[PDB]
Design a protein around this ligand. Structure first.
Ligand SMILES: c1ccc2c3c([nH]c2c1)CNCC3
Ligand SMILES: c1ccc2c3c([nH]c2c1)CNCC3
Ligand SMILES: c1ccc2c3c([nH]c2c1)CNCC3
Ligand SMILES: c1ccc2c3c([nH]c2c1)CNCC3
Ligand code: NA
Ligand code: NA
Lengths: 528, 516
């Protein structure tokens, strides 16, 4: 029996306790699991956003019903990221300015998949009409019924919990961590050691054999998961694996955040995450029951912490002298290798981007999914480790490129921050995709229906940012194809068939805006 | 109005008439379509095999029901390619030799999809048992109920046409061409010009402007599709686009073929294509109603045309002096670019590999599908042309790699041909996949009920030829519940196979019903 017998996970929070719970289930009680978590001072809950596959890929795999965990972490509902003021100059404001053409400066990035007609996505029929002046509708409203639902702040489910649309989740991350920690300890025999690490003990080859705690106890193991966050106490410090800084792709490096109490009854609750453009970055807004998490992501090359905190406070009309703020400086990039020897990095210790498209928890899940799939024995076959690393680096770089596109193709040039983003070099892959897009061709066309896509892990991981997402962002920001897809000029029936699709989207949106409960009401029912 | 107005297609046969029929439909009568087809000497019908998505990708787009076209080309059913004697030395024989482990030297590459347990394909559970000495079943018999159905030569559908398994088709290519030509002419307003091309007229920019015929008629056009076959009269000759020879990946370059009458009543009809290994290549067998097509594919570096013809005759006990044979020498590879200026190559004029995995017609309809989607206007946007070319080259090279795997990993070393295959260099992408396979990892895992040769297909060939992972997927060592669930899957395959061998009609009977 040459199997891993003990897995030691350094660090708790979402990364550590998601790893523990997942491997507990994946490894079917054949492996001892230890979490070594420093006890810490509970931070204000600044809110986390997610993508639709979370319930299916993670909580369902563990057999945790959606409502059970949502009730334990003040969870609310997410149908998109909504971008505000990414095209127009000015101070940060929660309220959208107006474009030169009269439109409001908002655009949505929802989760559905576009319908097609004659094997051509709805996006392309919309672009032909917009380019030809046959419509004044925005891409998001024309192509996703969810746009209308969001505009009216209606829920993604009916009150009897019948599904109306695709959605994901907002939640308090520390509450989810605490919930998973309770799950793993009581239901899965995880040992929790509440202590600090003082030593990393290694054999002649540099493989970790044990961790010493501050109390003297030695925790032996065969596989070590670094969930220590940005410090990367195992992968970067002990194992000396270099972190590739990628601030030459994404400039932001700091965040100031808080939770803001919120009059839900008065204002309603938005079923979406908002990315509010600022002078030196952007501010998230993540509605939960009674409060929203908010954080201003910024480059400290272009704004001082005091500057950013003042602008962030002004956004919400906060007293900066009488408000509880969390400040963080982040590294942007990834390790040269995510897994070295018998040390697997997961979460912040592995890689990070600003949460502009809710990447964080997905990255954690994808890594632990891939770890379970590439799980070694004590011979640590190099190919298993290499293939895992390959998946992590491709996953990360692809999302990195995608986020850069948000900044590079913003028309804003009103502050040195927004100007500086256009001095950065675009990755080859996004240059290629823009070329494809500008000729009227689809980018990363979906090959699966929506059920398969969000229901099969590999279907989404292998096609993560689809054609619809590129259209949401490019068109949202005002970047259009140079011309329509030339094939459309030869296909009058197909154009006619797309008109019916456009009309189906209108009818569904109108019906659901009329019949759906408010997000607020669905939340009140759910959380008692 | 900068639209293409006229499309001229050089060449008929399957490539030309599939192109014409497809664009007829895709372009919705907004474009004139002309086919310039040399009248030719009807060759003996040596048979073509296909892959399952022919009906969905091609005939369904045209709205032609499967039975309508099958009846018009003597079509039969294909559930796999069955490889015979690819592991054992000797002269060519239709009968399988015997392996060291007692199994017959046959293995199947069927179209079904493997079930999974705990997100791990059945293949990996099978491999774990075989590596640990817990089973002596072959991969195909353990993992595909279709293997049992094929062994009993049963049909993939019942007599009331309920589907039982995935399948594809065998047919007479000239009959399919003739059927599509009639379709395209009568139903899609395609003009058929029966004449020989004498000149290809080009402007100052190197764009084709017209073809002159031997009768004097000038055929003007805006976009030209080269379906002229291996000669590539437009893409290679007129446009001067270089052909990339890839005989340094696949050694075979010639074929001798015929049709063989067949006693269906006595023998039944096999619902599969057979690849019968020979000393200097291999021989296809493509059963149809009343005859099977057969052709010996060979490298002429290692056997003369006369050598191959004798060995091919010997396989089936033919009189080589009194049998009508067709002889073809092929180019293996692809053009440097499939589409140059206003000339799009489709079919043999674009690219070719030996029909070891029935690639031929797939290459045609994928190209025309891609042409319709990248269809240009008269400005011929460079990006449209480049993106089309990228798809053809990836499609071709990927299938090329897959075919090389069949030869590189044969254990045969009994003739200079089989020895020579191990001197060739493996492409980077196929080396990578072998590395992945050998660690027990899946290759190109299917995400569905882009990814053309999936994990199941790699196992069919690797395991079929005797190449196993170094060890089981290590994760399985931690998953006793998952192994127990896979056992139920294995039992489902036995129970399904047994039930269907008992309830299905023979292929022969289903064919009689269909063609009567
Ligand atoms: C907003 C935030 C994340 C996503 C993802 C999709 N749409 C989004 C919208 C589609 N699949 C990948 C993840
Ligand atoms: C900056 C630094 C860290 C973070 C984290 C989030 N946003 C950040 C911004 C949300 N997920 C948890 C961690
Ligand atoms: C700024 C950016 C991210 C964070 C996180 C906390 N505070 C922050 C401040 C605490 N919860 C987890 C993440
Ligand atoms: C070898 C060379 C050419 C061919 C063709 C088929 N098989 C071949 C084998 C099928 N019909 C069209 C052409
Ligand atoms: Na630049
Ligand atoms: Na000329």
């Amino acid at each position: 029996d040459n199997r891993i017998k003990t897995v030691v996970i350094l660090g708790g929070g979402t990364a550590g306790w998601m790893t523990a719970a997942y491997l507990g289930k994946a490894l079917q009680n054949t492996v001892k699991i230890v979490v070594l978590e420093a006890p810490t001072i509970p931070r204000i809950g600044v809110g986390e956003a997610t993508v639709p596959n979370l319930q299916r890929a993670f909580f369902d795999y563990l057999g945790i019903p959606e409502e059970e965990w949502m009730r334990e972490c003040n969870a609310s509902y997410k149908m998109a990221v909504k971008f505000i003021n990414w095209r127009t100059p000015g101070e940060g404001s929660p309220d959208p300015r107006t474009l030169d053409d009269g439109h409001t400066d908002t655009f949505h990035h929802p989760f559905g998949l576009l319908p097609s007609a004659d094997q051509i996505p709805l996006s392309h029929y919309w672009a032909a009409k917009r380019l030809q002046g046959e419509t004044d509708e925005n891409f998001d409203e024309a192509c996703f019924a969810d746009t209308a639902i969001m505009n009216a702040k209606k829920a993604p489910r009916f009150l009897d919990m019948r599904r109306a649309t695709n959605y994901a989740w907002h939640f308090d991350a520390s509450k989810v961590a605490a919930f998973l920690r309770n799950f793993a300890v009581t239901k899965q025999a995880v040992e929790h050691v509440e202590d600090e690490m003082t030593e990393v003990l290694t054999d002649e080859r540099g493989f970790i054999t044990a961790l010493r705690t501050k109390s003297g106890r030695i925790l032996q193991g065969d596989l070590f998961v670094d969930c220590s966050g940005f410090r990367g106490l195992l992968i970067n410090k002990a194992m000396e694996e270099p972190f590739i800084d990628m601030s030459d792709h994404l400039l932001c490096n700091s965040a100031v955040a808080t939770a803001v109490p919120h009059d839900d009854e008065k204002n309603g609750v938005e079923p979406y995450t908002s990315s509010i453009a600022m002078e030196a970055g952007w501010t998230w807004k993540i509605p939960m029951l009674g409060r929203f998490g908010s954080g201003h992501v910024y480059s400290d090359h272009f704004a001082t912490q005091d500057e950013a905190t003042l602008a962030f406070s002004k956004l919400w009309g906060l007293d900066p002298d009488n408000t509880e703020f969390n400040h963080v400086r982040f590294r942007v990039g990834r390790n040269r290798r995510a897994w070295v020897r018998n040390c697997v990095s997961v979460g912040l210790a592995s890689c990070f981007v600003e949460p502009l498209e809710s990447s964080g928890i997905y990255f954690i899940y994808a890594a632990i999914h891939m770890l379970a799939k590439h799980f070694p024995d004590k011979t640590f076959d190099k190919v298993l480790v290499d293939r895992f690393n390959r998946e992590i680096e491709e996953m990360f770089d692809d999302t990195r490129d995608f986020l850069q596109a948000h900044y590079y193709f913003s028309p804003r040039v009103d502050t040195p921050f927004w100007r500086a983003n256009k001095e950065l070099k675009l990755a080859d892959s996004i240059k290629d995709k823009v070329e494809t897009y500008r000729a009227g061709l689809p980018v990363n066309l979906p090959v699966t229906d929506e059920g398969t896509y969000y229901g099969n892990f590999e279907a989404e991981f292998r096609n993560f940012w689809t054609n619809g997402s590129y259209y949401c962002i490019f068109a949202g920001l005002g970047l259009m194809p140079r011309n329509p897809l030339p094939a459309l000029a030869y296909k009058p029936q197909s154009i006619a068939e797309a008109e019916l699709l456009f009309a189906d989207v209108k009818r569904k949106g109108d019906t659901l805006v009329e019949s759906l409960p408010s997000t607020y009401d669905l939340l009140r029912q759910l959380h008692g």
